[PDB]
């Protein structure tokens, strides 16, 4: 079981990428921190809002860790789906 | 430079296997805890 | 209310009360290949899983062994759960049957029986989250904890015959020589969980479940084979009409099995008492 996803690129690019990704998804975001975000998304089908928080940690000398955290249809499953879409774009 | 049971609400994943992705996280309902595993095709 | 303490007890407790402090919940996206879903079921060690439809953004029902029976009775593995549910228009004809955490256990048993199902998803109306999957098994265990620690109603001493709990007619069965594919047919036709296996004189020598049928299918080696030959690939709890309802509950719960085969002195099958039979007796009446 792996927490979040990883990248050995540069924090500038990593964050730059997520925002580019967030944009394609047509997701609302808010930079609370150079490396800490806050995302929203109205549900096209149920017409409700679901929000998560991104946060880039650092694990070792050259590796980085992007953390997804849910924020208080189905809340839980939609949280999985929001992430799944992001991780898909990032993985391209 | 970027920052370095708190795992609550955090996204976890098994390594993709044969086309299927498995996402998981532990959420709390009242005093109980539910770890949910979602199997979804890529 | 000594002779109705159990109904009162079930009315006074919520479904939330028997949810573990920490539990695991496996959910399948309906676009999952039926093959992968099954292996996922096996590797997680569960019998059924809630279904999430991404298109509808909603839980649309359960994936149970019965569904595999239906499919198999009629490439099968390569297709998506969606596709197969579509063939039967499952969503429309038999919509999701769920329940709230704050609903009473009594409502859980009522619903299980009324809707002739075995899996009842506990869903929070607030968040829409599936919290847990209710079963007769789990509900009976809960009830048991209360039964063996609270003065019992006199009717818990009355025998099986006296209470007429169970099914003693139309009993669907198989013979040792019955081809598995024939057993398959009688499953879909009688909508029954398990088939007593009887010998030449009609004596019960084994039990055959839907699970057994599907496991054999997984091996992929025709179905023509008889039931006993098939049962050799594996890896019989019975009762008498003169035994106390209490003793039957006890046997059924600790054996952790789904039903008892009611039987003659010569072990000729007279009937069957399942968990649902017990629940309906204890709670619904
Ligand atoms: N909670 C439920 N809601 C809707 N359909 C169900 C539910 N549980 C079981 N089913 C369906 O009922 C049939 C028998 O399921 P079971 O009784 O659980 O073996 C299967 O085809 C299931 O898809
Ligand atoms: N082999 C069988 N033949 C006829 N009826 C059965 C059989 N097994 C179970 N039943 C009945 O079908 C109902 C559902 O039982 P179950 O499928 O075991 O939950 C119960 O009331 C049983 O008495």
Curated annotation (Swiss-Prot), chain A:
List of residues that carry Phosphoserine: 61
Coiled coil: none
Changes after translation: Ubiquitinated.
Family: Belongs to the protein kinase superfamily. CAMK Ser/Thr protein kinase family. SNF1 subfamily.
Native species: Rattus norvegicus (Rat)
Locations listed in the record: Cytoplasm; Nucleus
Signal peptide: none
Span within the parent record: 407 to 559 of 559
Comment block on domains: The AIS (autoinhibitory sequence) region shows some sequence similarity with the ubiquitin-associated domains and represses kinase activity.
Expression sites (tissue/organ): Low expression in kidney, liver, lung, heart and brain.
Disulfide bridges in this chain: none
This protein's name: 5'-AMP-activated protein kinase catalytic subunit alpha-1
Swiss-Prot record, chain B:
Tissue specificity of this protein: Highly expressed in kidney, heart, white adipose tissue, lung and spleen.
Post-translational modification as stated in the protein's UniProt record: Phosphorylated when associated with the catalytic subunit (PRKAA1 or PRKAA2). Phosphorylated by ULK1; leading to negatively regulate AMPK activity and suggesting the existence of a regulatory feedback loop between ULK1 and AMPK.
Function: Non-catalytic subunit of AMP-activated protein kinase (AMPK), an energy sensor protein kinase that plays a key role in regulating cellular energy metabolism. In response to reduction of intracellular ATP levels, AMPK activates energy-producing pathways and inhibits energy-consuming processes: inhibits protein, carbohydrate and lipid biosynthesis, as well as cell growth and proliferation. AMPK acts via direct phosphorylation of metabolic enzymes, and by longer-term effects via phosphorylation of transcription regulators.
Domain commentary: The glycogen-binding domain may target AMPK to glycogen so that other factors like glycogen-bound debranching enzyme or protein phosphatases can directly affect AMPK activity.
Assembly, per entry: AMPK is a heterotrimer of an alpha catalytic subunit (PRKAA1 or PRKAA2), a beta (PRKAB1 or PRKAB2) and a gamma non-catalytic subunits (PRKAG1, PRKAG2 or PRKAG3). Interacts with FNIP1 and FNIP2.
Family membership: Belongs to the 5'-AMP-activated protein kinase beta subunit family.
Protein name as annotated: 5'-AMP-activated protein kinase subunit beta-1
Record organism: Rattus norvegicus (Rat)
Covered range of the whole protein: 202 to 270 of 270
Curated annotation (Swiss-Prot), chain C:
Function: AMP/ATP-binding subunit of AMP-activated protein kinase (AMPK), an energy sensor protein kinase that plays a key role in regulating cellular energy metabolism. In response to reduction of intracellular ATP levels, AMPK activates energy-producing pathways and inhibits energy-consuming processes: inhibits protein, carbohydrate and lipid biosynthesis, as well as cell growth and proliferation. AMPK acts via direct phosphorylation of metabolic enzymes, and by longer-term effects via phosphorylation of transcription regulators.
Motif range (AMPK pseudosubstrate): 105-126
Superkingdom per UniProt: Eukaryota
UniProt binding sites for AMP 2: 47, 137, 209-212, 234, 237, 258-259
GO BP terms, alphabetized: cellular response to glucose starvation; cellular response to nutrient levels; fatty acid biosynthetic process; import into nucleus; positive regulation of gluconeogenesis; regulation of carbon utilization; regulation of glycolytic process
One GO MF term attached to the UniProt entry: protein kinase regulator activity
Keyword Transferase tagged: no
Record-linked Pfam families: CBS
Family: Belongs to the 5'-AMP-activated protein kinase gamma subunit family.
GO cellular component: cytoplasm; cytosol; nucleotide-activated protein kinase complex; nucleus; protein-containing complex
Residues the entry annotates as binding ATP 1: 47, 62-67, 97, 118-119
Biological source species: Rattus norvegicus
Binding residues for ADP 1: 62-67, 97, 118-119
Tissue expression as described in the entry: Highly expressed in heart and brain, also found in kidney, white adipose tissue, lung and spleen.
Record's keyword terms, sorted: ATP-binding, CBS domain, Fatty acid biosynthesis, Fatty acid metabolism, Glycoprotein, Lipid biosynthesis, Lipid metabolism, Nucleotide-binding, Phosphoprotein, Repeat
Binding site for AMP 1: 62-67, 97, 118-119
Ubl conjugation as UniProt keyword: no
UniProt PTM comment: Phosphorylated by ULK1 and ULK2; leading to negatively regulate AMPK activity and suggesting the existence of a regulatory feedback loop between ULK1, ULK2 and AMPK. There is some ambiguity for a phosphosite: Ser-226/Thr-228.
CBS domain span: 20-74, 92-154, 165-225, 236-285
Phosphoserine modified-residue sites: 226, 235
Family matches, as Gene3D superfamilies: CBS-domain
């Amino acid at each position: 079981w792996h927490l979040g996803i990883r990248s050995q690129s540069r924090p500038n690019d990593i964050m730059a990428e997520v925002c580019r990704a967030i944009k394609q998804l047509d997701y609302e975001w808010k930079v609370v921190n150079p490396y800490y975000l806050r995302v929203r998304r109205k549900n096209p089908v149920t017409s409700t809002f679901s929000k998560m928080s991104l946060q880039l940690y650092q694990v070792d000398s050259r590796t980085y860790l992007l953390d997804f955290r849910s924020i208080d249809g189905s809340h839980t499953i939609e949280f999985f789906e929001m992430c799944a879409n992001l991780i898909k774009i990032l993985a391209q | 430079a970027p920052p370095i049971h708190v795992m609550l609400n955090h996204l976890y994943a098994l390594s993709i296997k044969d086309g299927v992705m498995v996402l998981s996280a532990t959420h709390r309902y009242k005093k109980k805890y539910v770890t949910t595993l979602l199997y979804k095709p890529i | 209310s000594n002779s109705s303490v159990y109904t009162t007890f079930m009315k006074s407790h919520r479904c939330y009360d028997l949810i573990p402090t920490s539990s695991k919940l496996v959910v399948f996206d309906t676009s999952l290949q039926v093959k992968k879903a099954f292996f996922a079921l096996v590797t997680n060690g569960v019998r059924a899983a809630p279904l999430w439809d991404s298109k509808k953004q909603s839980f649309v029902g359960m994936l149970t062994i019965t569904d595999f029976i239906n499919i198999l009775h009629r490439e099968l593995e390569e297709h998506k759960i969606e596709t197969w549910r579509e063939v039967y228009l499952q969503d429309s004809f038999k919509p999701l049957v769920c329940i709230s955490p704050n609903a009473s256990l009594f409502d859980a048993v009522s619903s299980l029986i009324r809707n002739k199902i075995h899996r009842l998803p506990v869903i929070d109306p607030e968040s829409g989250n599936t919290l847990y999957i209710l079963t007769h098994k789990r509900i009976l265990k809960f009830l048991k904890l209360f039964i063996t620690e609270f003065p019992k109603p006199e009717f818990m001493s009355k025998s099986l015959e006296e209470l007429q709990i169970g099914t003693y007619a139309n009993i669907a069965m198989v013979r040792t020589t019955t081809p598995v594919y024939v057993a398959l047919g009688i499953f879909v036709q009688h909508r029954v969980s398990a088939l007593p296996v009887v010998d030449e004189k009609g004596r019960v020598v084994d039990i055959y479940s839907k699970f057994d049928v599907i496991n054999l299918a997984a091996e992929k080696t025709n179905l023509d084979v008889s039931v006993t030959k098939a049962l050799q690939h594996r890896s019989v709890l019975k009762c008498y009409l003169h035994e106390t309802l209490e003793a039957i509950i006890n046997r059924l719960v600790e054996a952790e099995v789904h039903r008892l085969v009611v039987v003659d002195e010569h072990d000729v099958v007279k009937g069957i008492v399942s968990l649902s039979d017990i629940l309906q007796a204890l709670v619904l009446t």
